[PDB]
């Protein structure tokens, strides 16, 4: 509900956590230079996750978003993993339905092609689980490689179609993502799209969206029908 900073921090980290709680940008800038920004408090809480938690709902204000920026500028690591394969603040806010929080991190100069420190996967892949394309748009607008690949050669376009993240697929195609890239297994996005199209029920909402993807693919110059997998 209403979080209390004393449940997670003590000492100088608590003094900074209270400045964050109060949304006091100048006090945050003053204190962040002398505080250990990355040592976690209790319950896996870090000072940067605390800043995210203090910038949501009625606290999603320009100053409280800028607190995130200023903590990263001071040395708080936006790619710090949590234990047990849990994700960093940058990956976490890429899952949001609004890009304000990732933009506050990009405003501190986080690379849009950054990879996560546990799995080595480009953090932009985490946008595919968001309920709309706003966080992917923010990453692409800041200059991310639209054709970046994971360790198995999958692109955002390939992974988004597999995820059934069809609005991400459409956005990637409209922004000029290369649909002809083959993953290590030799598949293109289009190879899967053809499988999906062939099994879809005529007139279902899935059928309608997959055909829209096919039309947009062609409209942006993609090869159709696809070359069969070798």
């Amino acid at each position: 509900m209403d979080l209390k900073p004393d449940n997670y921090f003590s000492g100088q980290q608590l003094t900074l956590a209270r400045a964050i709680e109060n949304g006091e940008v100048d006090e945050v800038i003053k204190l962040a230079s002398g505080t250990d920004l990355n040592k976690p408090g209790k319950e896996d809480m870090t000072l940067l996750f605390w800043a995210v938690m203090n910038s949501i709902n009625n606290q999603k204000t320009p100053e409280r978003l800028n607190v995130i920026t200023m903590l990263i500028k001071a040395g708080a690591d936006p790619l710090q993993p949590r234990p047990q394969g849990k994700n960093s603040p940058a990956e976490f806010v890429l899952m949001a339905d609004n890009a304000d929080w990732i933009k506050a991190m990009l405003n501190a100069g986080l690379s849009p092609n950054a990879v996560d420190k546990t799995f080595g996967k480009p953090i932009i892949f985490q946008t595919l689980e968001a309920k709309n394309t706003k966080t992917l748009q923010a990453m692409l607008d800041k200059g991310a490689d639209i054709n970046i690949t994971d360790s198995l050669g999958n692109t955002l376009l390939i992974d988004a179609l597999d995820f059934h993240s069809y609005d991400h697929v459409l956005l990637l195609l409209e922004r000029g993502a290369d649909p002809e890239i083959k993953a290590d297994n030799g598949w293109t996005m289009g190879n899967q799209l053809q499988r999906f199209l062939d099994r879809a029920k005529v007139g279902s909402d899935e059928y309608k969206k997959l055909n829209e993807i096919k039309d947009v693919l062609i409209q942006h110059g993609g090869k159709w029908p696809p070359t069969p997998v070798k």
């Binding site: 979080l3 394969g85 994700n87 806010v93 993953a183």
Partner: protein, 191 residues
């Protein structure tokens, strides 16, 4: 409780199945058919049980059923199926979607079993993440990572099967084992 190795018991169970399938008696013949199917199904249900023992997904899961190896933390082995560790679980909180991948030992199972991916069933100061996820508009949808894995496995060149609450799985294993004991009795009755 068990005198022989898993491999020896697996072979001896197939030997008994073969004896039933060769019987003139129709009850022994159908008992052998069901026994063969349940012998396979109980191994899958034991893996389905095993995923509920995973705590840290980046660490070993204890009590992997004999004759199987957990490859969920072996990037090289997963690559064979087009998988990596990252896609096997959710990462914002304690995992809701979690899968584990197991390879059968051919020394035990020969070619009877395939690599198998098993999906686990979906499930105040420490709940700060769930607060954050709600204010951030997080979808929090178990199905997304499950469908994604289904889409990927359709491209796998190497054969891989899909399988997979904890109490219900245990009861299921009870019912399967009970059926096995009944079919073994029928078969032995016709010798």
């Amino acid at each position: 409780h068990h005198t022989s190795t898993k491999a020896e018991r697996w072979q001896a169970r197939k030997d008994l199945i073969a004896k039933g399938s060769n019987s003139l008696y129709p009850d022994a013949q159908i008992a052998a058919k069901r026994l063969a199917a349940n012998n396979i199904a109980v191994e899958k249900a034991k893996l389905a049980e095993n995923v509920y023992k995973t705590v840290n997904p980046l660490e070993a899961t204890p009590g992997v059923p004999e004759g199987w190896k957990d490859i969920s933390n072996d990037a090289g082995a997963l690559k064979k199926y087009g998988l990596d560790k990252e896609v096997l679980f959710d990462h914002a909180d304690t995992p809701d979607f979690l899968a584990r991948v197991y390879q059968p030992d051919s020394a035990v199972f020969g070619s009877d079993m395939n690599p198998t991916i098993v999906f686990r069933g979906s499930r105040n100061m420490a709940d700060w993440i769930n607060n954050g996820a709600q204010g951030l508009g997080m979808e929090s949808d178990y199905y997304k990572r499950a469908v994604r894995l289904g889409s990927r496995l359709a491209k796998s060149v190497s054969k891989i099967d899909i399988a997979g609450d904890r109490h219900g799985i245990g009861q299921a294993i009870d019912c399967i084992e009970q059926q096995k004991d009944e079919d073994i009795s029928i078969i032995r009755s016709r010798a």
